[PDB]
Design a protein around this ligand. Sequence first.
Ligand SMILES: Nc1ccn([C@H]2CC[C@@H](COP(=O)(O)OP(=O)(O)OP(=O)(O)O)O2)c(=O)n1
Ligand SMILES: [Ca+2]
Ligand SMILES: [Ca+2]
Ligand SMILES: [Ca+2]
Ligand SMILES: [Ca+2]
Length: 341
Amino acid sequence: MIVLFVDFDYFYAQVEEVLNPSLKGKPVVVCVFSGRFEDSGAVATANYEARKFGVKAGIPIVEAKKILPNAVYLPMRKEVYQQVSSRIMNLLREYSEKIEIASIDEAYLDISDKVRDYREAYNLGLEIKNKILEKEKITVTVGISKNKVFAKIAADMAKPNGIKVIDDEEVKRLIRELDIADVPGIGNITAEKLKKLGINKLVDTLSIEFDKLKGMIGEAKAKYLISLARDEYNEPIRTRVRKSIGRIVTMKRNSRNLEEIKPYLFRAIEESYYKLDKRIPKAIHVVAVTEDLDIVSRGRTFPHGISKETAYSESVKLLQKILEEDERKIRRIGVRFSKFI
DNA sequence: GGGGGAAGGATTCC
DNA sequence: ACGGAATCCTTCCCCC
Ligand SMILES: Nc1ccn([C@H]2CC[C@@H](COP(=O)(O)OP(=O)(O)OP(=O)(O)O)O2)c(=O)n1
Ligand SMILES: [Ca+2]
Ligand SMILES: [Ca+2]
Ligand SMILES: [Ca+2]
Ligand SMILES: [Ca+2]
């Protein structure tokens, strides 16, 4: 089995540089403004020009401007990136319809069939890395190896606009040297917790007692890692479908006033149905970020699809439910629809 | 003891 | 106490 991973480089930002080529070479920073007050928001993604000066995804738009006050700060236009993504996906979709669109800018391509060998598989990378650059002028890094997890690791190592192959030997070198913190799906929180238990390499997960792990990071997350250190991972490249769609918005001011919130909540839903588009959801989650940034949410699953009229109706109840089991004032409020029909 | 699921909390950027 | 979209995942639950 041979898996080929593709990752669009600084995607949201690069897309913008493609829509306005006057930025290429300039620090471009795609942001998300909450409108709570000018420059209130966070950085979604930056290009390498911004990044090399300390501007990364997640920091407040304010602190980002203190570093690079003269960079091009642009608002998020997910929709645009979405269509661009689709096109690139269908583009890839023609090298193995046994692909997995992991995210708006990640995709795992099973090239087991289409080509056997680490030489011809690599040359399928440029055959693809060149076409995407040609057909849509987008630079995409390629990762290639035995399973999704290492192909993914390969790309993170070669970026941007690069390519790398992690054969069966390297996989072995990494499991003993790769920083646990660099493993796909291991966030800051999970990495830290691993420092404690005494883990810093994928291999260390073999010393500790499964039971200890299972308690600090969970069975699943636990099995995942052990599985990796054993080169005994292998998980198929499968279709995968967005399993939820939603919208959370920051209210102009905080509150605990049901009637002051409604409009935002009702805007979240209406704006969530547009993005649903025909798909029918049977589960709804009214979500609310607290005054202290804690995500509290209450949902409900029905034995049928949820008509929008019903969303309005139920979204309120769930909201009234929240206010009951909490104290904090609500800052951001939104909805989430799932369990599609 | 454990299936099948809903619900709520937590974490990754998938 | 500066944003947002999703998913992961650990517990509660009805009941065989
Ligand atoms: N705090 C964060 C961190 C990340 N993201 C988004 C940014 C786009 C998406 C994927 O990010 P990466 O995989 O890190 O890629 P990138 O940042 O878009 O750029 P590159 O692929 O070149 O690393 O996650 C976000 O919204 N909020
Ligand atoms: Ca990317
Ligand atoms: Ca990515
Ligand atoms: Ca990490
Ligand atoms: Ca990443």
